């Protein structure tokens, strides 16, 4: 045993080494030995963790996809369901397309959600309205099939109920709204954090009469936020802002805000540059600029644009793509995020249109499916907008300062150096820059010290970095010598009060006013 081989390795080492290879490689390795074949075709974990990276279910290899998904793979189930619904990759005749495609897509979507662990439900966004005006679109077919399955499922049906309820929530009908609310009630009956929080949000708008119900709501909010939700945490961070009515102490509210403000870590970095052949961040700047323009066209909120940029960054960090596909990535991410959170979405026929038909319907379908499958289903993540909102609902400040804070919060999207700081620190520094720009006597208040859990000395570097990377340096141009000004053009609207054209101070003035030297 001087030279040990792969032949005599134990089950754990073989399990781990075989879980990080693509499907083509795992098929190739299956030709080496009989014991390897027995291990692969006997133990379901190796198939369960196998990739299906850059493949898509064609009629030649439908059996492979079905076999891998049916025994513990999530990517295969997602791709199979999306291919069955969107009808790209499978040669299904138009006469029998509807029923068979709907049932297959619904079954595979249910399996994909069942195999998901530790994420908020997401499969409801592939079937959300608007639907076909005439006839029966496959989205409706899979919707009714999923409803029937939930009526007949036993293992894990709460996620299916939540997805169903989220589907009819976006329907403009009082009956549809009552069926939706009726849905998270049944989902909350079996236990679901997001469903319970949505139920609570549907009750805050209804009954605000006496402090007793406010205390009941505070109890439920504490229960939800303690478990680990995100929307619940953000909502609870403002019910503490309602400190006067709500029975509690100043120290408790300050502690809650400190906990939610010191529980963030910097995530993104130069990983994306070193994980591909090359990006040079100029292509990212171009893509984000174009996405900002498209969001300006169709009245898209700040939150959706931030989510789209974050999803783009996550996918780019996970699965590599060639240069000529970045715009496809951006359009697919905007479609997916707009479907997720917003109300008016970027429809697929429209989605391909802005790209000057450079790509096609099928390519966008494939990119959307693979983007969703590569993110494991986690779409909503901490973003600067949430902390900007929680900080501006605490300290009462003038409207121009609010608009400026929003403007510097949105300018972090283009630049990637601002990822070295957590969203909490960056949002606090943005509020600090908004206050100091208007020349208020006291930038940082004792209330802010007690709430944000940080002092001035914890915020000097972040303000300097934000101001430099936002206004200072120069704009990236190569031939046209014209700066990319979609964000500035987005913020020249009268709805924002023509904020973007007001002057701002220089880096030297900011350093002088903040007591920071230079060299």
């Amino acid at each position: 045993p001087r030279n040990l081989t792969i032949l005599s390795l134990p089950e754990d080492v073989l399990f781990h080494i075989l879980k990080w290879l693509s499907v083509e490689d795992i098929l190739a390795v299956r030709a080496v030995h009989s014991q390897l074949k027995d291990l692969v075709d006997n133990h379901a974990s190796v198939w369960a963790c196998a990739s299906f990276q850059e493949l898509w279910p064609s009629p030649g290899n439908l059996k492979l996809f079905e076999r891998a998904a049916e025994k513990g793979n999530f990517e295969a189930a997602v791709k199979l369901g999306i291919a069955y619904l969107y009808n790209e990759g499978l040669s299904v005749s138009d006469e029998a397309r509807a029923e068979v495609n709907g049932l297959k897509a619904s079954r595979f979507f249910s399996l994909a959600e069942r195999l998901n662990v530790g994420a908020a439900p997401f499969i409801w966004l592939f079937i959300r309205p608007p639907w076909s005006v005439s006839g029966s679109c496959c989205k409706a077919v899979v919707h009714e099939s999923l409803r029937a399955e939930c009526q007949l499922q036993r293992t894990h049906k709460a996620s299916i109920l939540h997805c169903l309820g989220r589907v009819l929530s976006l329907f403009e009908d009082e009956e549809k709204q009552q069926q939706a609310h009726d849905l998270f009630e049944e989902a909350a009956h079996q236990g679901c954090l997001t469903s319970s929080y949505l139920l609570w949000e549907s009750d805050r708008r209804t009954d605000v009469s006496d402090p007793g119900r406010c205390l009941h709501s505070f109890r439920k909010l504490r229960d939800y936020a303690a478990k680990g939700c995100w929307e619940a945490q953000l909502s609870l961070a403002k019910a503490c802002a309602n400190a006067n009515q709500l029975g509690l102490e100043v120290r408790a509210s300050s502690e809650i805000v400190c906990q939610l403000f010191q529980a963030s870590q910097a995530v993104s970095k130069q990983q994306v540059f070193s994980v591909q052949k090359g990006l040079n961040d100029t292509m990212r700047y171009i893509l984000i600029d174009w996405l900002v323009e498209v969001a300006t066209m169709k009245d898209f909120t700040s939150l959706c644009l931030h989510l789209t940029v974050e999803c783009v960054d996550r996918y780019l960090r996970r699965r590599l793509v060639p240069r000529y596909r970045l715009q496809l990535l951006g359009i697919a991410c905007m479609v997916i995020c707009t479907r997720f959170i917003s109300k008016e979405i970027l429809t697929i026929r429209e989605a391909v249109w802005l790209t000057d038909n450079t790509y096609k319907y099928e390519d966008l379908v494939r990119m959307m499916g693979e983007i969703v499958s590569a993110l494991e289903g986690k779409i909503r993540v901490p973003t600067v907008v949430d902390y900007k909102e929680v900080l501006l609902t605490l300290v009462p400040v003038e409207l121009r300062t609010q608009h400026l804070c929003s403007f510097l919060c949105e300018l972090s999207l283009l630049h990637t150096s601002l990822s070295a700081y957590a969203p909490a620190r960056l949002a606090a520094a943005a509020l600090l820059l908004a206050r100091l720009t208007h020349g208020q006597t006291q930038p940082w208040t004792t209330q802010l010290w007690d709430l944000t859990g940080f002092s001035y000395e914890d915020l000097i570097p972040c303000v300097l970095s934000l101001h430099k990377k936002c206004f200072h340096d120069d704009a990236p141009k190569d031939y046209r010598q014209v700066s990319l000004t979609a964000v500035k053009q987005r913020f020249e609207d009268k709805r924002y009060g023509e904020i973007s054209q007001e002057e701002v101070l220089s880096y030297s003035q900011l350093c002088a006013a903040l007591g920071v030297t230079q060299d």
Binding site: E293, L354, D356, V482
Partner: peptide, 13 residues
Amino acid sequence: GRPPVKRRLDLET
């Protein structure tokens, strides 16, 4: 720089 939204972005340096 610039053209309208409908475009094929020029990534090439």
